[PDB]
Symmetry: D2
């Protein structure tokens, strides 16, 4: 696996935890802004996904988790990271700063062989496990895992589209509070609404997830768009998708299609439920998107509103490792 | 006005506050679960709408607000309340338990001329100020003022339908917590999701608002439907309407139809804004529906998503007094 | 173990989960207000302690958890519960209604052998594991496990008192939201502040925990008292104890005493930490009370403020089983 | 008044709002991180204190509030601001970055007569209206107004000390979230607990308030100390003071000393209440400290716990204008 992580942030730390679960191997981490003993603390304690059960300690300038030694670098510039030194080959780029092919290539300077951008990218090909891994080629050096929301929508859109055909659709993601928000009314020049107190408000916001689905599923390109609402919940969001279908159908055909997909080809990616669930029931859920059967409504044989849950960064993190696994498989074949 | 209120709850109490400003006259209140000295407290202090600025005190087994003497009864059953004794002709039924024409007719025993259900009714004619008040005739003894959400949607639907014709629409309301939810996971046999902790979850929920619009605007009957998401905010909700129009139009055309309506026929009922607003900016707002221009999005010339705000507690109260004033001008004409 | 539970509430359900963890045996449950299939749902999904990992299902009028069959009764009156038929001997009384020895004895009419009140009791002897179990005798038929807060304070007070002697102390428990609170301003005749919107306010409140410690540790009787503040957090509370000591000491002697106790005699009951913890780091913590070393302050050699965390009902639930285990040990000797 | 403000943040903005009511005169503002059209927005809309009722608009590169023309500068460094140009003599330093007499003296280059640090200073004389204003002399060029918490505590401490003598006390402040906290777990190298999600946790924190009272009331120097708990509320905090008095007294005696002080020497600064109040009942309150009689508790005749509220944003702002008015009456005398 020889995985390396650049940027020990919320995604970066969750990717590490996930790796330890799924048995993947992380050999080095790079973050110039977080001191070594502070990394231990941020990795150990997590307000949402709880206490890390296992041993975590600093030992000889390295981070030791459950006996596994992880080399730590503090380079501000990607080109200066000794990836090869630590034996890191597949780099998870999660700083949110080097998201373009050009910027991301600086990692090859240090010995890296592949770079996975854990965010949307203006030019790196984007992948959503279960939707388009068919497009991945061994000679792609830099790839993107899209966004948390795209990984939720894509699976659902794919199932709907391949069965009833999406003519057009509008989306709303009722989203949990994010790190770019503020506790109290403060300055946010790039997004005035985004600066208003997060715990007090419902905040209309943006999302590129709908457009992004147009890149992951080309036929849908230009047929979907959407927005978001930031609400005062700590974790877990939900996708409210309203679509106009090309084939007439009953809401039962839709539940059937989703259920079949979840047990078959999209198992582990798309979940299915008929229980009376609420956002908290999905904290720590592995799947990228869970179809809420009871929450959806159908107005006519071709006009329906479908609902799908997803744990923000947690399901996304499982997908990052999944993507790296598929890649290494195709890369060594 | 000679108004009487049954149910000194969130609405009952705010209708009184609103009445004291729009100059209406409340002469009697009735609530068994609230003692006289306790009413002084619940009316004076309000977590959401602030401390009441004015004099509120008990005097002669009566409630005295800024001089106004208000007779208080504590009956547990409607037909008991001696409305006639206090001189209460028009009754605001805001307990949420006697919503049908039958149950609400109880107040007639006490000597009440008319009854206004501050909630949707299964059989009492429903009204929405600015949308269908012309259908009200004096011979009507019991009327409904619909729900908070129907009052926000109807105005917006009227405008969209009158200008571009609504073919079909699906609505989602990101709603603030209500008195029927629970602070922590608790029992709610009729609505399992509804019993989940309201401070931690995004709770899918139902709503009849979209269908009710089918009763207020006959032409839209059966062309609208929706659902809700209960979020952790104390007050102020938003309607997310995804609609398919019959006439091709640009989003500028939609903004123009809205602004226009808010200056003429629906002024004071439908507001229009282009600011980067958030839910807290509407606490205490008098309008039934405030169109958020910047938040809306358009996919095609006939498929657009519209967003409108509403202070579910306050605005509805203002509309309750407004409905009574219209009724009395027609009843005494 | 032959444990039976009366009242499948928040405590009742957590006690069941805990029993399954600790390997205790629950053979029957009684709750007249919760339907059988609804019990499955409330046991499976928990907003705070998450999804129950394991199988849960209704089977032949019984509840089956991980293959273990649990008989379900729906008796409104304790005397009518067939405890003996289900083989239940130790009854966890968690309805909050039959908390006195007299009321609790009705369980013996159904065949029960012992009753543990999972709440304070006006007359049943009270126990706090690790503080006064020595006093328990096999012929006590009804006992109380005190409250969640007493189980947090008692351990800490015991360590402080036996080492430096508590002359007098005042306590404040900054407490998470409770089920007896309201989502929005509503009626609460027995507690006006307690009826104010829970998500919007800091609510001064009461606690009997200080007085109760006077019964668990007699020497401290009449030397402690306190209050509470209800804050908008879903789970986990913290005890802020200010005491005047009889022996002069340094804050280091205090940390030393707490650390020693946590590793020795109070292990599993009193935790100790020097990390920069926050309330969420304790969700799901087994201990009754965790001493926060860094949070405390000392003004003089005999005046100090000590801080201790506790997960509300979760640590308490582990203590209920612990108490039943000690009891059965002493009871069969 | 000729007031100028540096730092249009929560305080900067509220000081302007307060000034517009107490009739003070603000003639200039300065903030680099906020553009002119953005100031109109941040001042007009406020999540906590409501939408500003009045006219706010940009005009001639100037901010115009209800006619008042306010010159705007955007400098990044103090000594630059051309205060003299606008006619700003008294400067409210509310950036929180130039709190020392040295750093704050920068404003002197611009032609500023006096500077008031809207935060504690390490070396500028600290004042608390109603407690030590009699110690201010015109020869003072740079002064501090202490912190929100010191302003709540000092009044209460003065009264307790003057009447019963404070031997020693320990303070806990259950504080609302501030601009320096994070919405979700994020980096905060100088305060690890401080970086934890503010919407989910009770976060232990430090405070200098209790010691600062030692500087405002010299006699209490070294006899007071405390700490804080940051909770998920937008505004309004409470002081929980556990104090040991030198003279035996009853709680009635304490209530009487408080009520008395609030009608004479400390009226308008220290409030007194006996109602069942909660934090939201103090949003927008002008007083620095509101004594909550019902919440207090007494253990013995010399050991009592006192509780006092304060709207940390609003009340402090009012005190800032008050301090300037006192300074100008003395400066021009
Ligand atoms: N929101 C989405 O969430 C994603 C980011 O999530 P996140 O990582 O949890 O955010 P977060 O801000 O928590 O993570 C940023 C992390 O990257 C680190 N960082 C910043 N600059 C550098 C650098 N030059 N080299 C190495 N590390 C650096 C930083 O110290 C921190 O640990 C993006 O895809 C966004 O679009
Ligand atoms: N608050 C919002 S947002 C809103 C908006 C639109 C419509 N409504 C509807 O208005 C109704 C009341 O809502 P609410 O104000 O939130 O309720 P809330 O529970 O706050 O108040 C209801 C009041 O009814 C009183 N009451 C109960 N039973 C009786 C009785 N038998 N006789 C006399 N009084 C009684 C009770 O003491 C309580 O204060 C419900 O049907 C709602 O669905 C609420
Ligand atoms: N308050 C205290 O809080 C504790 C309970 O907390 P909690 O579990 O969160 O309260 P909660 O109200 O959630 O639990 C009460 C449970 O007891 C059940 N119950 C009520 N009456 C009866 C009855 N007659 N027979 C059987 N079951 C009944 C009820 O259906 C519910 O499941 C008690 O120890 C109380 O003293
Ligand atoms: N609300 C509470 S609790 C309270 C009470 C009393 C005092 N204070 C203190 O008052 C200070 C300001 O608080 P706040 O209002 O929350 O600040 P906040 O950070 O919200 O605003 C400060 C403003 O200063 C601006 N600024 C930064 N640097 C400069 C500069 N170099 N030149 C000119 N302008 C600049 C900046 O853009 C920002 O908008 C802090 O030190 C607080 O700790 C807070």
């Amino acid at each position: 696996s020889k995985i390396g992580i650049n940027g020990f942030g919320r995604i970066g730390r969750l990717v590490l935890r996930t790796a330890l679960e799924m048995g993947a191997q992380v050999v080095a981490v790079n973050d110039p802004f977080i001191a070594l003993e502070y990394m231990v603390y941020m990795f150990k304690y997590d307000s949402t996904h709880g206490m890390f059960k296992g041993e975590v300690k600093v030992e000889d300038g390295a981070l030791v988790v459950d006996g596994k030694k992880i080399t730590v670098f503090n380079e501000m510039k990607p080109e200066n990271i000794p990836w090869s030194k630590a034996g890191a080959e597949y780099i998870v780029e999660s700083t949110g700063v080097f998201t373009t092919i050009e910027k991301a290539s600086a990692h090859f300077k240090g010995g890296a062989k592949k770079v996975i951008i854990s965010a949307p990218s203006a030019d790196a090909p984007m992948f959503v496990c279960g939707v388009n891994l068919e497009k991945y080629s061994k000679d792609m050096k830099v790839v993107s895992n899209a966004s948390c929301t795209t990984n939720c929508l894509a699976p659902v859109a794919k199932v709907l589209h391949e069965n009833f055909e999406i003519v057009e659709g509008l989306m709303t993601t009722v989203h949990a509070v994010t790190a770019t928000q503020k506790t109290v009314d403060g300055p946010s020049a790039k997004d005035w609404r985004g600066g208003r107190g997060a715990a007090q408000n419902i905040i209309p916001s943006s999302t590129g997830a709908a457009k992004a689905v147009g890149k992951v599923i080309p036929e849908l390109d230009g047929k979907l768009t959407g927005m978001a609402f930031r609400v005062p919940t700590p974790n877990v969001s939900v996708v409210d998708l309203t679509v106009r279908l090309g084939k007439e159908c009953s809401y039962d055909d839709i539940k059937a299609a989703m259920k079949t997909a979840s047990e078959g080809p999209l198992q582990g990616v798309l979940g299915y439920t008929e229980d009376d669930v609420v956002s908290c029931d999905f904290t720590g859920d592995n799947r990228s998107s869970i179809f809420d059967a009871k929450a959806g409504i159908q107005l006519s044989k071709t006009f329906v509103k479908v609902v799908s849950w997803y744990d923000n960064e947690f399901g996304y993190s499982q997908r990052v490792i999944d993507l790296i696994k598929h890649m290494q498989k195709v890369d060594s074949a």
